[PDB]
């Protein structure tokens, strides 16, 4: 139906936290996901939330909860790596609903570096 992604660009460095917002439009029960496109790939489905607990955690440490309330889907890790450099995209759908896609997030990570 609908999907608001307000920040278009995230700069971060490596081991800090991230949260990428999103904003959704229905009024019915809302199917919502996450997306994320690496460089030289195809979209791949990141996280999603049908039912249930609100809470959904998908794979490397990402996690998004759905607020009717505030009707969120802000997707959250505590420490980025490196390779989280993507785009990310919400996604909102429903039962006679079709899938709807936000204009996503491009999330930039600086590496940590030592010696
Ligand atoms: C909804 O917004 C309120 C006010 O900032 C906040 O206290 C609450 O935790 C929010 N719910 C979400 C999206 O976690």
């Known amino acids: 139906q609908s999907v608001t992604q307000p920040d278009a660009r995230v700069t971060v460095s490596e081991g800090a936290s991230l949260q990428l917002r999103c904003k959704y439009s229905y009024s019915a029960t809302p199917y919502l996901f996450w997306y994320v ?10 996280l999603k939330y049908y039912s249930g607990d609100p809470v959904v955690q998908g794979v490397n440490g990402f996690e998004a909860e759905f607020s009717k309330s505030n009707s969120s889907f802000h997707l959250r890790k505590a420490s980025v790596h490196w390779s989280d450099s ?3 995209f919400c996604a909102v759908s429903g039962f006679a609903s079709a899938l709807t896609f936000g204009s996503g997030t491009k999330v930039i990570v600086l590496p940590y570096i030592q010696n």
């Open 37 to 46: 496109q690496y460089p030289r790939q195809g979209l791949q489905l990141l």
């Open 86 to 88: 993507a785009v990310y």
